[PDB]
Structure formats: structure tokens, C-alpha cells
Design a protein around this ligand. Structure first.
Ligand SMILES: NS(=O)(=O)c1ccc(C#CCNS(=O)(=O)c2ccccc2)cc1
Ligand SMILES: NS(=O)(=O)c1ccc(C#CCNS(=O)(=O)c2ccccc2)cc1
Lengths: 191, 191
């Protein structure tokens, strides 16, 4: 729609500057519409970022749901690698939205609640798979599954974001998947 | 000095509200001085937070240096637990400064560089101990030591902060030390 044009303009402009340096008039100009026509589709530039983040987070969530219903036929290391890779590829494909979404989180209760809702879902699913692994006798009963899942998911949130944002310090982007898979597998399967 | 009174006032006021909701006049009033006398000791409320964070970070750093020179006589699990506990106790004792310091980081190049400098030091020290553990034949040569160290330190930064800030999701504060020690020990010693 013109809606898609506003979203595409915002994702494109977030690649060279922060949301603070983008005006409603910048987004309108980019989408070939007026300022008031803009305000028809979205109440604020903040609402545009929220919609962009919602789309990225639901893409990750739907990719993980697809994988959950369609297990890869490989060893347990390559199965965790496949699941972590959903997040690596999805957020890694939308770095500017990921970086601006993380920033907004301090300032936007809707952005903070969106990230919180999905992190709770992804942790609950992580804990359920660890529990299944313990029930089949492949993983030892060590930490409570939900607490282990929480820290592994927060590790991935922080470590993926540092790599994508080029922070110092960070794991290089070409090494981060293998780094996370090692810590997940040793911490889930180790005595 | 009056310097200490300004710092004590700022740490006390950060326990009930963010830096954005504190005025230079609030800090002056709390320290029993005028606004211009305030500006003698610090150029901005931002500079007060930077000094508070600098003190907290250097307290952690000096506690870790003391431990490094004075190894506990216990198994390797309790030794990593002792080292992680420096961070748990130091930042956990200064939650309001930790929370405001993390926030400022998006907005303050000095705060971002301070955290970055110390994270690089703590990762370099973590990697050196893993390497020593591999050299003595107690730890297997798995991931590159520096990349493993990076992700474990970023895990701790994020997970400690979520617990302290009461985020959803978070590991409960009374379980976070044990959760982190499990992941460090299994990921450092596991094949
Ligand atoms: N947001 S996050 O990056 O912390 C994260 C969150 C969750 C997951 C996951 C998962 C598990 N699904 S599975 O990999 O298909 C699998 C199936 C069966 C046996 C082993 C594994 C990965 C990452
Ligand atoms: N900022 S952070 O929380 O990620 C972190 C960073 C670094 C450390 C540490 C450490 C290692 N020193 S040691 O524990 O004394 C030890 C000595 C000998 C044998 C095993 C261990 C802990 C935590």
C-alpha cells in the first residue's frame, strides 16, 4: 500500500541514521506522500518503528514455529544450530530495525512489551525442548530448565546484537553462530 | 568533600527516578550547595553519573585484581563462582547506578567507552585463565578462548542487569549466580 512504502522508507533510512535523526517529513517524502497523508497511516515515526519491529519479531517467531513442527534429521548439535540460526538470519537480515528496536526499548513501553512477550515465548519453548531432552534421557537434570533457558536466550539477545551492531567488544559475525551453539550444547548436555 | 555529597545525593535520587527526572537543582539542593557551586564540581548531571559509574566499575575491577593475585583454595567450579560473584556483589550493591549507567550508554560516548574499556579488560582476563586451564590440561581446546570469553561476559552483562532491573524475562536474583556458574563451567570444561 502507501503503508508498505512508508515502512520500506523507514527501514532504508534507519540503515544510515537513528530514528531521532529522521522526521515524519523524511518518511513522507521517501514514500511519495504528504505529511498529513502519512498521519493517516501512522500516528508517529515511533509507530512506524514499532510496526517494523513487530514484522521482524513475528518473522523469527513463525520461522521457529515452522522448524518446531518440521524437525531437521541430524544430531542434537545441528538441531540447536538450526534453531539459533533462525534468530541469526532473521535479525541479521534486518540489522537497522534490530538496532533501532533495541534503542527504542528504553523509551517505548510498546517496544519493551513486544520484545518481552516474544522473549518469554522463546524461553518457554527452549525450556520445553530441554525438558523433552531430559525426559528421553539425552540431557542430565542440572539447572532448572526455565532458568537455564532464560540465561541462554539473554546471552543470544546480547551477543547477536553486539555482533550485528559492530560493538566493541563483540564476537565477529562470522564466528557468533558457532560460539553460541557451543555454549548451548555444553550447558544443556554437560554434567 | 562537597564532591562526595553531590555523588551520594545523585546515587540516592537514582534509586527512585531516572537521570532525566533529576535536575542540577535537585542535586545541588540534596548536597546543601547552590546551583553555581554545583557547576564548580561537575559540568552536568551527566558528568555526575559518569563519575558514579567510573567508581562502581573500578571497584569491580580492583576486587577482581585482588582475587586474581589471591586465588581461593577450592575446586575450579568454586573459583569461577568467586570471580563471577565480584560482579554480582559489586553491581548488585549499586543497582540504581548500574541501571542509569546502562541507560546513558546509548546517549553518552564517555559512558559507552568506559563500559567498553572494562568489558575488553575482563574478557581478556577471562580468555587468559581459560588458556591457562587448557595449558595445564584441565580444559579441552574447543572454541577460541577469546570468543568463548566474549560471549560468557556478554551473557553475564545482560543476565545480571535483567535480574537487578527486575526485567521480564529474568533469572530471579537469588538463582542468577548459580545459573551463570553452570553455563561458564560446562562451556569452559565440556568437550
Ligand atoms: N532467541 S534465542 O536465539 O535465544 C533462541 C531461542 C530458542 C531456540 C530454540 C530452539 C529449539 N528448537 S530446535 O533448535 O529446533 C531443536 C529441536 C529438537 C532438539 C534440539 C533442538 C533457539 C534460539
Ligand atoms: N564481567 S563477568 O561477570 O562476565 C566476569 C569476567 C571475568 C571473570 C573472571 C574470572 C576468572 N578469575 S577466577 O574466577 O578467580 C579463577 C581463577 C582460576 C581458576 C578459575 C577461576 C568472572 C566474571
Amino acid at each position: 500500500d502507501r503503508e508498505l512504502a512508508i515502512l520500506a522508507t523507514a527501514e532504508n533510512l534507519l540503515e544510515d541514521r537513528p530514528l531521532a535523526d529522521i522526521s515524519v517529513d523524511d518518511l513522507a517524502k521517501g514514500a511519495g506522500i504528504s505529511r498529513p497523508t502519512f498521519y493517516f497511516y501512522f500516528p508517529s515515526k515511533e509507530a512506524v518503528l514499532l510496526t517494523l519491529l513487530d514484522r521482524v519479531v513475528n518473522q523469527a517467531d513463525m520461522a521457529l514455529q515452522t522448524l518446531a513442527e518440521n524437525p531437521a534429521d541430524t544430531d542434537r548439535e545441528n538441531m540447536w544450530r538450526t534453531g539459533i540460526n533462525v534468530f541469526f538470519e532473521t535479525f541479521g537480515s534486518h540489522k537497522a530495525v534490530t538496532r533501532a528496536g533495541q534503542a527504542a526499548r528504553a523509551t517505548s513501553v510498546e517496544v519493551a512489551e513486544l520484545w518481552s512477550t516474544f522473549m518469554q515465548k522463546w524461553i518457554a519453548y527452549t525450556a520445553a525442548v530441554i525438558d523433552a531432552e531430559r525426559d528421553r534421557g539425552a540431557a542430565p537434570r542440572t539447572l532448572p530448565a526455565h532458568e537455564l533457558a532464560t540465561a541462554l536466550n539473554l546471552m543470544n539477545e546480547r551477543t547477536l546484537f553486539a555482533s550485528f551492531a559492530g560493538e566493541q567488544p563483540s564476537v565477529p559475525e562470522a564466528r557468533v553462530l558457532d560460539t553460541l551453539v557451543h555454549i548451548w550444547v555444553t550447558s544443556i548436555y554437560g554434567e
